[PDB]
Amino acid sequence: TEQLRVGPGLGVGPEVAATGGFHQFYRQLPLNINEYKLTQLPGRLVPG
Amino acid sequence: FVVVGKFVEPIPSNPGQDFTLLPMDQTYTFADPVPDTATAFDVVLSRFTDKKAPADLLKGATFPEAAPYTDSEVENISKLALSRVKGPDAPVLSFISVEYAAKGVDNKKNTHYDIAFMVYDQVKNFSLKLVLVAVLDAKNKLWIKKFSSFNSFTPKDKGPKGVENIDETPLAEFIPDFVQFSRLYKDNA
Amino acid sequence: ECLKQILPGVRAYALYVRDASLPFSGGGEEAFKRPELATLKGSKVLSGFLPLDR
Amino acid sequence: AGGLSQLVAYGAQDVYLTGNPQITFFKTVYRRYTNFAIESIQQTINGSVGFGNKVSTQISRNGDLITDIVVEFVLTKGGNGGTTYYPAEELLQDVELEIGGQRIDKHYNDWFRTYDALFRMNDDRYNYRRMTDWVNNELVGAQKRFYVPLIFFFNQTPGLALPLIALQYHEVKLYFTLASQVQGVNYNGSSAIAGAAQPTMSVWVDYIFLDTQERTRFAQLPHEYLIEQLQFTGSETATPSATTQASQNIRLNFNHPTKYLAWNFNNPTNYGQYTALANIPGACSGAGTAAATVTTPDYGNTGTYNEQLAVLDSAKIQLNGQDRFATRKGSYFNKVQPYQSIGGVTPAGVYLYSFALKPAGRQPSGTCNFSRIDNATLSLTYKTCSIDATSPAAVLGNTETVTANTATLLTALNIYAKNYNVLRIMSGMGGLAYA
Amino acid sequence: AGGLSQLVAYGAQDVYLTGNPQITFFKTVYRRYTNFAIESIQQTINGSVGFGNKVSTQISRNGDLITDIVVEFVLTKGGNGGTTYYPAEELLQDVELEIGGQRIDKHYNDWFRTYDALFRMNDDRYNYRRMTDWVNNELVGAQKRFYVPLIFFFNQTPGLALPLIALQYHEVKLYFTLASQVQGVNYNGSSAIAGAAQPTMSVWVDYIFLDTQERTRFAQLPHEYLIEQLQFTGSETATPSATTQASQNIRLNFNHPTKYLAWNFNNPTNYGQYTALANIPGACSGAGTAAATVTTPDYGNTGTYNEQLAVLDSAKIQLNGQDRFATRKGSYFNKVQPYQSIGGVTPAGVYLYSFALKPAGRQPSGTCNFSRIDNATLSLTYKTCSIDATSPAAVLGNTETVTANTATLLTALNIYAKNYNVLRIMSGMGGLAYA
Amino acid sequence: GGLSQLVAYGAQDVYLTGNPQITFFKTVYRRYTNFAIESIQQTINGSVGFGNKVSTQISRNGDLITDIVVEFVLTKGGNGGTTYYPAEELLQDVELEIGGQRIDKHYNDWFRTYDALFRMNDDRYNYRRMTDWVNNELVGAQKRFYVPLIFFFNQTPGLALPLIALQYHEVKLYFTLASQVQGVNYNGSSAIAGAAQPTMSVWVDYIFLDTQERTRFAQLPHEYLIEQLQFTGSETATPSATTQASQNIRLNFNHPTKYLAWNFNNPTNYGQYTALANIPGACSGAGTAAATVTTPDYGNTGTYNEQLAVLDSAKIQLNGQDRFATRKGSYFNKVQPYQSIGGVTPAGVYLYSFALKPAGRQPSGTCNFSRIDNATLSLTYKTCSIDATSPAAVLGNTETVTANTATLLTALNIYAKNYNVLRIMSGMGGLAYA
Amino acid sequence: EIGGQRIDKHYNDWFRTYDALFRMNDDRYNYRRMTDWVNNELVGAQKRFYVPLIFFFNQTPGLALPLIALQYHEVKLYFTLASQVQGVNYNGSSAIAGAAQPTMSVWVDYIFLDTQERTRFAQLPHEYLIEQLQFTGSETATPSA
Amino acid sequence: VGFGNKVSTQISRNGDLITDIVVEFVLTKGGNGGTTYYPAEELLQDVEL
Amino acid sequence: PEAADFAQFAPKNLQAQNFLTATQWIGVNTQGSSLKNANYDLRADPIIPKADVGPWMM
């Protein structure tokens, strides 16, 4: 066989043996669950 | 996308020599994510075989030659065939040894050979078994009928599907009547 | 839905008539088949004597 | 972050697992099946039911196909807890399956015991025991309804349901022989139990009612069912002794593609006794005390996993006089063979040799066709029966090649073979492709 | 010799097994599957927890599909070993599954107990107990985290993973009712335990993260899932008596294609008590000694396999007044039905009648549609409750048709059924096709 | 009766029985290839004895190989209660080498971990019957043990190793026998005078193929998707009586991993994954005055009593990001296997699956650690404040604590089971990825 | 329940709370007369009680539930009976020996429409503005001396 | 970790930038009040970046 | 697929037989309801326009 020996590094296809060194740039943020359950009501005034 | 510049800094006072520390981008892709075993070698070696010019229509009836194969006609024609692999992107294919070597003598003063040998691709760090069906005329011309890799000569078919479980018993077909429930719901509107 | 019942209906009837009309199914030895012994002991039955060649 | 961080880190090595994906796991397609219903119908038993009697039933045409058959018994304990051992199983001495006068198959009480010992397991085995014995320390006079499921090929899967509707010319009968005696019910060892009750028996058959489309096909079209059959012969066991390791060559009078062979040694006096008796806890009546005897088992604990009481030192099987595999210890056939081929835990004294990758299943997976073999022989070597069974230290501290002096009581050998045949049903008649 | 001597013995009888081969067992081709990842994510519980509280959670859109759900609880023993019985199961009184406001399903603590009694087995059954009870002889004050898995269709197989992603406009919710009392935790029979701690609770949902290609298809395509639902109704048991055989005609207020129907008789006082109490080991508090009483169970051993303590004598199900099967003994529903249909062991007092070949699985394999049965009835006959529960001789030496006088306390009847409906998802919303 | 169920057909049944595709009243058996299976003894090179290394080369007798069972004969160096899976302990390790390449390697502890986690019910009991003395046997008792191997080709015929296709490579199993086996040649640290040395035999079950299939194996290239075990030992943060130790253990693993499994143990006593205590079965003489909480009841070394386990909680993180929310240790001991295996796991043994069904053979989701720069297992230990000699202290205590004797469990064993591809062609085999 | 959906659900305590806030004067008294014994009845006395439901359609004709328009869906009422009732089967914590089990019956007042109105209700879609009760139980922070 | 020992850490790549770093120590008093002087500082003999 | 066209079958005039068996549709409801056909109101019960729309109306 060829014995590929893939290295570290995520966020890319299998064609890349290594992408990052000690700190890869790829980062993922959480989906911020229940974001629709927040209304964000504005403020209003009273009759002067 | 990284920006590499010149780093404008003041001129050094006493010396002129310093540490450069050139930029480097440590990332290595593969030529294919799955390791090549014999297919790439099969096409590159298949384009080096000769045409129908040998005309060795006869069966030959090759017989084996049990020997340690130190230095004889089998390894000589094997190295002669490996020397024919001189393409632009062709591998080096360092020769190793021969197993299952057969010679056949044709009444028209010909010598056919069925030589299986092992090669070691140094650029890819691995070994392969190649099949060389080559004949030799009386005028020392070595015609190669088929030069490819072993295990690439697959049989006619692979019958069993290779079930994973030992005993699972899949559900049998219903085998309906004259319409098989497809034309029944398709013909009606 | 009617054809789901009729198409098999027709089949059932036709096969019925076969059986109603003809003895057992109208078939032959295929139906009235005794088990095959299917063992090899008989392969070793030997001749008792040899004739003179003529 | 989270599960997404695993999903995103796809590499070269993952191509073999998910590249060019073919399947998923998160959406199941169930297949549409035919309409059917299952109903329990009581059958009529002809002949008198009782100990030692032979009775039979003819399965009625109360559905189209049949599967499960359960023989019910009502037994009354003739003694206290610990005096019986699977008594409903012992009672049903044998069962014969005949279609149109042709024997299809036949089971024996010992087979039911071997079959269970070898192929059932865990809670299944326990529940089975609950249906054939008293397992909650019941007392003398206790009355219980037992259920003995049959183990014929059509009693194991709907896929082999017997198409009674396709057997218009042939009747299907089950003949049942009841034992002359059952331990802890009407006899205690060799002694009759005065006042013991006769068993009440009933045979139940679970019928499959098909809808019109399928019912028609079964009634009208020919069928082929790959079926299992049990071959069985009894043999005298060469008797081992304190002075010797008996050896024996048993010709195996078997035929057909065989999935496996199974066997046991036993004491015909005590149902299910496949091991020597001993004064170690659970190995004999009264074991552990002054009253202990190694002439009578603790019936409720007749079976055991203590290999020290087994008698087979080693065995091999020859085909046409040639070794089939290297000789292995009896413990191989007791523990490893079923480990590999079944996955349950087989009691000491019960042995298996498989020819199949998975003999416990329905799908054939390698067979030994004995109809093509001239001399199949089982070669056995027995253990030296020198250990004084009345001294637990002698037993518990013994060596691999020896057993209890009481092991010489296991003079009967039962050899079974389970094979394939083909059941053909056509034009209202049926029988087997091979004899 | 060797394996080759078997291989060579090929003949006519082997053609059905190996001629023109279709499969091999010596080379497996694994299928390439889609990309996904699994993560266990804590959901927020809306509402205070503790005994008697009712809370709910909404499953957040963390992943695309959801399957397994485990409710964690932390309980502390209110007494010593032997005082509790599956207390985390008892605690979770019930769980309701709702999508878009439609009730999809609902389970009860007793259902979890009944389900387990019938469908879990062996080490799974034990491991389950380890997640809901104290099984290592723990003492008062012992604290453990318990894990109560849910058993809704999507909590059993990835195949029915709930497509939360395809329900873009519908919320998926779970309502959890906690018991007001849990035996051996905050109450001992009818008495409260001073100082008992209130439970801590958390709901964990295992999410499936799909890659883009699969995620998109789930989000955009319509779906039809064939799923199972629980139907449940409680009934009062015709009071068992020592004077006669109580009997009862129970209307079966059930609907939908039912894979099976199951029931149990219990003393509602004591969770999991499906049998009469008695002075035999494990059958009552203090059983076997001077302190024994048949008014309180050995809670740690509440369940039993000794049918003698089960009240049901016999039963049948009628559909529109017609017997759906011949009347069978309660022991038939307790032992044979689960032998045939499940393969585990069912505790005394729990009865199963299947309308399916394999009700323990996902493929319907035969159902009884009660939405087409004008008047289904369960007809039960009870044993005579004349056995002196405090006297082992009477408890253990009795007859088939009788039980303990204490069986009169099994005044509750729980009838359950599992059936198939369709969960349809379209245009971002979904719910069940049949009401 | 049954007929009324057929009649009672509604709209709801269309999804169950409309336009039938299948039937339950007909089975089709699939015709298969011709083959035979044979058990053949291998030659053991080297020298069998405690602490010795031996090896065997699999003879080319059949075409494919599957099961391998190692037989051992041991005698008891003491009475019942002194041994614990001694044949499992004895096979210290086994290495699978093809043509000089290490394909895999198992350790006695793996066999114990694997069994404890993935086997079950009567299979597990039978296994114990083949590796230990389970009928209260006494000193001097002799028994033959059978230790099955669990390499990918020993799990299923589907991965039978095609020796026929490996003409240029030999297949060897290298074994290390333990220097000591509890209750056989040593009792705790004390040698047992007169103990016998083991007798060993290695058996390989071979598959003999008929002509067409045999030829396909010999001539076709093959790619087997197989399992491998990765394993490293680590120093366990030592838990204590006053504080909860915590530790970040880097997971130096690679390849698509189905699951991680781990335990903490006292290396002195094989199979001890939990603390010892004066409660029945939890120590030698437990439950009485003579109880010693520093010496296990060897015959009852394993337990389901979580109180004696040391993991408070754990999480896995990848490149610093949480893989999943932190869960209590009992989750990895009871729920993970409840969800992914369906068996019961002994206290002190933990599993975290990245796969839907890790106990099967078909890939069902993996974590490829070869693509992670820093994979870490983060463990929080329980407080070891309980006086193990006082049952009340043990049995009536809280969630976050354990026995003071739990601090003896200083060896951390982390396993990872992954996939790779073993490609056979050119008469040689080898791995697709390193 | 309508069509498998929970529309609403009331509890005995809601009926008590509802009454406490919304019924009054003689309506409240007459209500009590239908759910209790208010004329100093004695032990053994038997009485038929009438407990009206207070779901939106039980309050006004304006919200009459169009059963005619729900041809494919069923409408159901599930009633849970208390395990104990004070002065009926329990006295404080003590069971009352000999206490009778309740008799129960559910009565529904049905509107019969003439042809034109009935047809429109059956065929037209409807939007009924209705009320629902939301309810949860909580632990009371307990005050002290 | 212990007195007189040299230990080290590679700062992980969990975020993008780093600012504050705090080394925590748990120490116990080997004598009464007045016997120590900023001992956490004394213990951390040096730190190399 | 089952029963291979038997052109040699003589009784092809199966007109004297009634193959339809309306035994499965006796007592059905709209889709799967169970109310014993619910013939309560002594009126005509007009047709309700059930349009096959999605989970919402519009």
Query: How would DSSP label each residue in E259-286?
Result: EEEEEEEE-TTSTT--S---SSTTSSTT
Q: Tokens 């034309």, residue? A: B183
Helix H segments across F83-140? 86-90, 108-118, 121-131
Q: Is D336 left (phi over 0), alpha (psi -120 to 50) or beta?
A: alpha
Backbone dihedral angles phi then psi of residue D54, each to the nearest 5 degrees: -110, 125
- Nearest by Cα to E135 from E187, E91, E184, E72: E184
Up-side HSE of residue E214: CA atoms within 13 Å toward CB? 23
Phi-psi region of D250 (alpha: psi -120 to 50; beta: other; left: phi over 0): beta
CB contact under 8 A, A20 and F373: yes
Burial class, E202, CB count within 10 angstroms (exposed 0-12 / middle 13-18 / buried 19+) = middle
Distance CA D131, CA D149 (A): 9
CA–CA gap between residue E205 and residue E66 (Å, rounded): 7
Q: How many CA atoms lie within 13 A of E152 on its CB side?
A: 25
Burial H8-29 (b: 16+ CB within 10 A, else e): eeeebbeeeeeeeeeeeeeeee
C-alpha closest to that of D35 among F22, F17, F27, F2: F17
User: ∠ CA(E362), CA(E365), CA(E370), 5° rounding?
Assistant: 100
C-alpha to C-alpha distances, B98 to B118, D160, F168, F326, G45, nearest whole angstrom: 6, 56, 12, 59, 111
For residues D20 and D324, what is the distance between their CA atoms, to the nearest angstrom? Answer: 45
What CA–CA distance (Å, rounded) separates D340 from D342? 6
Is F41:F57 a contact under the CB 8 Å cutoff?
no
**CB of H13 less than 8 A from some CB of A:** yes
Judge whether G67 and G75 are in contact, CB under 8 Å: yes
| DSSP secondary structure letters along G78-127 | -----S--BTTTEETTEE-TTPPPPP------PPPP-HHHHHHHHHS---
Residue in F92, F34, F125 with CA at minimum distance from that of residue F267 = F92
- Return the partners of chain H (3 or more C-beta pairs < 8 Å): A, F
Which region, left, alpha or beta, applies to residue D241 given φ > 0 means left and ψ of -120 to 50 means alpha? beta
Out of E32, E306, E397, closest to residue D17 by CB: E32
Cα gap D15→D13, rounded to integer Å: 6
D27 touching E, CB under 8 A? Answer: yes
Residue F208, helix vs strand vs coil: strand
DSSP code string of D60-119: -SSSSEEEEEEEEEEEE-SS-TTS-SSHHHHHEEEEEEEETTEEEEEEEHHHHHHHHHHH
Closest CA to E35 of F339, F224, D9: D9
In angstroms, rounded to a whole number, what is the distance separating the alpha carbons of residues E168 and E41?
19
Euclidean distance between the first and the last CA atom of chain F, given in angstroms as a whole number:
65
Which residue in the set F7, F10, F11 is minimally distant from I23, CB to CB? F7
Q: Which two tokens stand for residue C48?
A: 């008792």
Residues of C whose CB is below 8 A from B179: 3, 7
The C-alpha of A42 sits at a distance from chain D's nearest C-alpha, in angstroms, of 32
How are the residues of chain E apportioned to helix, strand and coil, as percentages rounded to the nearest 5?
20, 35, 45
Please, do chains D and E touch (3+ CB pairs < 8 Å)?
Answer: yes
F373 contacts chain A (CB < 8 A): yes
Separation CA D150–CA D172 (nearest Å): 15
Q: How far is F177 from chain E (nearest CA, A)?
A: 31
How far is Cα of residue E283 from the mean position of the Cα atoms in its chain? 22
Residue E349 near residue E413, CB atoms below 8 Å: no
Supply G87's token pair: 């002065």
Chain E interface disruption, residue of B34, B164, B167, most E CBs within 10 A: B164
Q: Take residue D326 and report the two structure tokens written for it.
A: 């290297």
Nearest alpha-carbon partner for F133 in F189, F192, F184: F184
Q: Residues for chain D: how many in total? A: 435
Is residue A29 within a helix (H) or strand (E), and if so which, with residue range? Answer: none
CB atoms F7 and I32 under 8 Å: no
Token pair 């203090």: residue:
E286
User: Do residues F265 and F310 make contact, with C-beta atoms less than 8 angstroms apart?
Assistant: no
Give SS3 for E18.
helix
For residues B95 and B78, the answer to whether their CB atoms sit within 8 Å is: yes
Query: Which are the contacts of E391, defined by CB distance < 8 A and separation ≥ 6?
Result: E279
Cα Rg, chain H, nearest whole Å: 14
Helices (H), F177-247: 211-219
**Inter-chain contact B174–F426, Cβ cutoff 8 Å?**
no
The Cα F138–Cα F299 span in angstroms is 12
Touch between chain G and chain F: 3 or more Cβ pairs under 8 Å: no
Query: Tokens standing for E55?
Result: 């809370």
Q: Look up residue D374 and give its DSSP letter.
A: S
Question: CA-to-CA distance for A3 and B124, rounded, in angstroms?
Answer: 9
Chain E residue whose CA is closest to C35: E13
Considering only CB atoms, which chain F residues are within 8 Å of I26?
7
Question: Could you give the maximum distance between any two Cα atoms of chain G, in Å?
Answer: 69
Strand partners, D40: D206
Q: How many CA atoms lie within 13 A of F150 on its CB side?
A: 23
Q: Which residues contact E157 (CB under 8 A, 6 or more apart)?
A: D28, E67, E362
Cβ-based burial of F17 (10 A; exposed 0-12, middle 13-18, buried ≥19): buried
User: How many angstroms separate the CA atoms of E413 and E418, rounded?
Assistant: 17
| Tokens found for residue G53 | 């439901």
Best B1, B24, B25, B28 member to test A by mutation, with max A CBs in 10 Å, is B28
Sequence-distant (≥ 6) Cβ neighbours of residue A36 within 8 angstroms: none
Exposure of E6 in the CB half-sphere (CA atoms within 13 A): 28
Q: Are E329 and D146 in contact (CB under 8 A)?
A: no
C27, containing H or E segment: none
The backbone torsions φ and ψ at residue F357, rounded to the nearest 5 degrees and listed phi first, read: -135, 70
Q: CA F228, CA D13: separation in Å to the nearest integer?
A: 13
- The burial of F189, by beta-carbon neighbours within 10 Å (0-12 exposed, 13-18 middle, 19 or more buried), is given as exposed
Residue pairs spanning E and I at CB distance below 8 A: 32
B-chain residues within 8 Å CB-CB of D213? 176-177
From the CA of F415, how many Å to the nearest CA of chain D?
18
CA distances in angstroms from G55 to E94, E100, F310, G29, G125, listed in the order given: 25, 21, 56, 21, 21
Which residues of D239-297 form beta strands (DSSP E)?
A: 247-251, 257-266
Structure tokens at B5: 């510049």
**What are the two backbone dihedrals, phi and then psi, of residue D350, each rounded to the nearest 5 degrees?**
-110, 125
Interface test mutation site (partner A, options B24, B25, B30, max chain A beta carbons within 10 A): B30
Q: Which chains touch C (3 or more CB pairs under 8 A)?
A: B, D, E, I
B172 vs D360, D429, E25, G118, CA distance in Å?
Answer: 21, 24, 20, 53
Q: Residue E351 pairs with which residues in a beta bridge?
A: E263
What angle in degrees, to the nearest 10, is found between the helix axes of C2-21 and D212-220? 20
Chain H residue with CA closest to F372: the answer is H13
Rg (CA), chain F: 24
Q: How far apart are CA E308 and CA E275, in angstroms?
A: 9
F259 neighbors F389 (Cβ within 8 angstroms): no
Q: Which chains touch G (3 or more CB pairs under 8 A)?
A: E, I
Question: Which DSSP symbol is given to D215?
Answer: H
Query: Which residues, 6+ apart, have CB-to-CB distance to I51 below 8 Å?
Result: none
| Resolution, angstroms, 1 dp | 3.5
For F26, nearest residue in chain D (alpha carbons): D159
CB proximity E11 to C under 8 Å: yes
Supply the Cα-derived Rg of chain E in whole angstroms: 25
CA distance H22 to H5: 19
What are the chain F neighbours of B118 within 8 Å (beta carbons)?
Answer: 168, 426
Residue E100 parent element (H or E):
none
How far apart (Å, rounded) are the C-alpha atoms in residues G73 and G77?
Answer: 13
Greatest C-alpha distance within chain B: 101
Residue partners of I7: CB distance under 8 A and separation at least 6: none
- Rounded to a whole number of angstroms, the distance from the CA of B173 to the nearest CA of chain D is 9
* Strand-pair category, E36-43 with E402-404: unpaired
Numbered residues of chain D with Cβ closer than 8 Å to any chain B Cβ = 11-12, 15-16, 19, 31, 33-34, 157, 159, 213, 217, 357-358, 360-363, 365
Structure token pair of residue B103: 């010679």
Give the pairing of strands F35-42 and F22-27: unpaired
Backbone angles phi, psi at D261, to 5 degrees: -110, 150
Give all strands (DSSP E) within E284-383, no chain letters.
Answer: 312-319, 322-323, 328-329, 350-354, 368-369, 376-382
Do E13 and C40 make contact, defined as CB atoms within 8 angstroms? Answer: no
Burial class (CB in 10 A: 0-12, 13-18, 19+), F197: middle
CB atoms within 10 A of CB D241: 15
CB-nearest partner of E54 from G74, G137, G139: G137
Chain G residue numbers with beta carbons less than 8 Å from the beta carbon of I37 are none
